[PDB]
């Protein structure tokens, strides 16, 4: 997250760190959202590589013991069947991970609430991105979980020629694009939380930014729109 602020440690208890085994240690690669005690939602592109993955819930500082972490292996990966790794702009950038064990819920570990199917945010709706991704273009991962305020940019604007043009689809949400705050590598797969009728819900799964950099004016961060995939998610969980 570029241009973020450190999150309070109990603000975003559905945020997870997806990590891969790197020698004798583990490394953060992506974010995710806990959606059942044994299921995580993330981006498909985060699981393209044939790595050994684990999920960490209750994480705040990747480089210190917080006293709240639960570590759980990933047992099964279900990527959206239309996902095509060499065409992120086509969409379908979403995957579900079934955890080896069910995690225990507490003030640091909670299920993400999802929007009702079909819900679209009005232009300029208040949202936060969260994650441990790079804090500058071509920088380094954050230590502590970051948040940044990114108002939504509706489809009519986001799909206009000076923004993303045809690359953005109605199955996506765009947010930010102010040139200061954005998602960045390592934030992929994590949540866009938007305040609707008094309650934060996870409306986006972080999908992509510009190749010209993370915080680029008129290139808002692009998220998979969770509300387009409610039936898919329920179908997967009910059949696994």
Token digits of residue 69:
């972490």
Q: Which residues contact 160 (CB under 8 A, 6 or more apart)?
A: none
Length of the chain, in residues: 240
**Is residue 110 involved in binding Na ion (CB under 5 A)?**
no
Ramachandran assignment for 218, one of left (phi > 0), alpha (psi -120 to 50 degrees), beta (any other) = left
Burial (CB count <10 Å: 0-12, 13-18, 19+), residue 179: middle
Decide if 188 is catalytic: yes
**Is residue 66 involved in binding Na ion (CB under 5 A)?**
yes
Name which of residues 14 to 33 contact Na ion (CB under 5 A).
none
Q: In whole angstroms, how close is the CB of 69 to Na ion at the nearest point?
A: 5
The residues with which 16 forms a beta bridge, in sequence order, are 32, 57
Coil, strand or helix at 165:
helix
**Is residue 11 involved in binding Na ion (CB under 5 A)?**
no
Select 17 or 227, whichever has its Cβ closest to Na ion: 17
Decide if 80 is catalytic: no
Select 66 or 110, whichever has its Cβ closest to Na ion: 66
CA of residue 179 relative to chain centroid, distance: 20
Contact yes or no for 121/205 (Cβ under 8 A): no
Select 61 or 137, whichever has its Cβ closest to Na ion: 61
Site string for Na ion, 26-65 (x = CB under 5 A): -----------------------------------x----
**Is residue 119 involved in binding Na ion (CB under 5 A)?**
no
Contact yes or no for 22/86 (Cβ under 8 A): no
Q: In whole angstroms, how close is the CB of 223 to Na ion at the nearest point?
A: 26
Catalytic residue among 45, 60, 80, 193: 45
Annotated binding site for Ca(2+): 59, 61, 64, 69
- List residues near Na ion by CB under 5 A: 61, 66
What amino acid positions are annotated as catalytic residues? 45, 93, 188
């Amino acid at each position: 997250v570029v241009g973020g602020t450190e999150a309070q440690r109990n603000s975003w208890p559905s945020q997870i760190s997806l990590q891969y085994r790197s020698g004798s240690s583990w490394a953060h690669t992506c974010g995710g959202t806990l959606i059942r005690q044994n299921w995580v939602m993330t981006a498909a592109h985060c699981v393209d590589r044939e790595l050994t993955f684990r999920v960490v819930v209750g994480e705040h500082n990747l480089n210190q013991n917080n006293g709240t972490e639960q570590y759980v292996g990933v047992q099964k990966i279900v990527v959206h069947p239309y996902w095509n790794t060499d065409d992120v702009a086509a969409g379908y950038d979403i995957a579900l991970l079934r955890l080896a064990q069910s995690v225990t819920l507490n003030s640091y570990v909670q299920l993400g609430v999802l929007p009702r199917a079909g819900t679209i945010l009005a232009n300029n709706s208040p949202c936060y991105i969260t994650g441990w991704g790079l804090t500058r273009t071509n920088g380094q991962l954050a230590q502590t979980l970051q948040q940044a305020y990114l108002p939504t940019v509706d489809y009519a604007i986001c799909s206009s020629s000076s923004y993303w043009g045809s690359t953005v689809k109605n199955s996506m949400v765009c947010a930010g694009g102010d040139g200061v705050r954005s998602g960045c590598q390592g934030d992929s797969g994590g949540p866009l939380h938007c305040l609707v009728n008094g309650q934060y819900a996870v409306h986006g799964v972080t999908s992509f930014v510009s190749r010209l950099g993370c915080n680029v004016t008129r290139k808002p961060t692009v998220f998979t729109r969770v509300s387009a995939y409610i039936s898919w998610i329920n179908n997967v969980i009910a059949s696994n």
